[PDB]
Amino acid sequence: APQQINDIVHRTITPLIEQQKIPGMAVAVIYQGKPYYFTWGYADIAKKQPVTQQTLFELGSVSKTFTGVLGGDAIARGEIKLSDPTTKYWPELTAKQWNGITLLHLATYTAGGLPLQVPDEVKSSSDLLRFYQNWQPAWAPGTQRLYANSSIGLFGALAVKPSGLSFEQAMQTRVFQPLKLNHTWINVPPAEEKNYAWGYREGKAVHVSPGALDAEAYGVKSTIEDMARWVQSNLKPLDINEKTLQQGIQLAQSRYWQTGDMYQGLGWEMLDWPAARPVKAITPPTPAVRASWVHKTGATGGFGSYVAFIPEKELGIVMLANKNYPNPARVDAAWQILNALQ
């Protein structure tokens, strides 16, 4: 790799790994459309397995960018519309609070305060229906943003109903395969277990536990190579052959709401380049802006991830670690690296 990239990355990440006591890490920098990989440490401390370009990390909430793009693809296929009421896809949602709550609200966390997590008690299909029927919003839809897994998670489950495919099957078929993300999974197959890093929480090895709507909100596991590919796809959707996927990617980066300096897309969040929050509606949504800092932070009990890219510079970065460490430290490192190469 160019010495400039090699230098800025190592000088930035080595100290980071030291200060945060991160067991293992993988980083990919996309510079002018080409990826450069870097790895440090262990994927498995006890078995002394090193982190490699083939190691699988839990992406946590970064998984929402996939859900957002799959949703955008379904819109491009004409299978759903973001302006559609939630009940059009789940007739059983008869409780009055759902009137006026659309797929856009679910996808962008503006439904009126859906909770961050789906309760652990919710297992079956009926348990989930009950959870949403009994939920009482604190606000009218489209007025406040409250980041939530139960919100985008529902959007994901409903967005694939018309296709008749399960969520995982729709993701594999419409997103993973076409983009050649052959090492990205919702459920890690026994064949890939040798590459599945352990997460570490308080020194204990851990893997994300199963939960309702986990696939849609925080369940994708991927390698640094596939994530770099995911970033290249999102940097240049126009280079994607599948028409609906190309549009779906563009749709996920459109600006639907503004809260301060941040704009909410579908999964992705953006800021111009270079916690209940009231939001201003962008009417109509602004189509993906090239001069943006597009990003998403993610975590699980044992992992921490970050993705950020700047379309107009053909520049991007992906950071995957098997320790959930402070978001500001992630963003700080990412900014040092991209600013330097910017």
UniProtKB/Swiss-Prot annotation:
Q: What is its EC number?
A: 3.5.2.6
Q: How is its activity regulated?
A: Inhibited by the beta-lactamase-blocking agents avibactam, enmetazobactam, relebactam, nacubactam, vaborbactam, taniborbactam, zidebactam, and beta-lactam-analog boronic acids, via a covalent binding to Ser-61. Inhibited by non-beta-lactam, benzo(b)thiophene-2-boronic acid (BZBTH2B) and various cyclic boronates. Not inhibited by clavulanic acid. Inhibited by O-aryloxycarbonyl hydroxamates, via cross-linking of the active site Ser-61 to Lys-296. Weakly inhibited by citric acid.
Question: What reaction gets catalysed by this protein?
Answer: a beta-lactam + H2O = a substituted beta-amino acid
Superkingdom of origin organism: Bacteria
**Could you tell me which PROSITE patterns the record lists for this protein?**
BETA_LACTAMASE_C
* Localization per record: Periplasm
Q: Name one matching Pfam family.
A: Beta-lactamase
What are the positions of the active site? 61
GO cellular component terms, semicolon-separated? outer membrane-bounded periplasmic space
The record's annotation in InterPro entries points to: Bact_CellWall_Synth/Modif, Beta-lactam-related, Beta-lactam/transpept-like, Beta-lactam_class-C_AS
The GO molecular function terms of this record are: beta-lactamase activity
Q: What is the effect of changing residue 61 to D/E/G?
A: Loss of activity
Entry keywords, A to Z: Antibiotic resistance, Hydrolase, Periplasm, Signal
Its Gene Ontology biological processes?
A: antibiotic catabolic process; response to antibiotic
Result of mutating residue 149 to A?
Answer: Lowers activity more than 6000-fold
Positions contributing to a beta-lactam binding: 61, 117, 147, 149, 299, 324
Under the subunit heading, UniProt states: Monomer.
Q: What else is known?
A: The class C beta-lactamase family has a specific amino-acid numbering system known as SANC, for structural alignment-based numbering of class C beta-lactamases, or else the simpler name structural position. A multiple sequence alignment was used to derive a consensus sequence and then the consensus was numbered taking into account insertions and deletions. This allows use of identical numbers, e.g. for active site residues, despite differences in protein length.
- Function text: Class C beta-lactamase which confers resistance to penicillins and cephalosporins. Has benzylpenicillin- and cephaloridine-hydrolyzing activity. Has weak cefuroxime, cefotaxime, cefoxitin and oxacillin-hydrolyzing activities.
> What family name appears in the similarity comment?
Belongs to the class-C beta-lactamase family.
What PANTHER family is this protein classified in? BETA-LACTAMASE-RELATED (PTHR46825:SF8), D-ALANYL-D-ALANINE-CARBOXYPEPTIDASE/ENDOPEPTIDASE AMPH (PTHR46825)
- Name of the protein this chain belongs to: Beta-lactamase
| Species for this entry | Escherichia coli (strain K12)
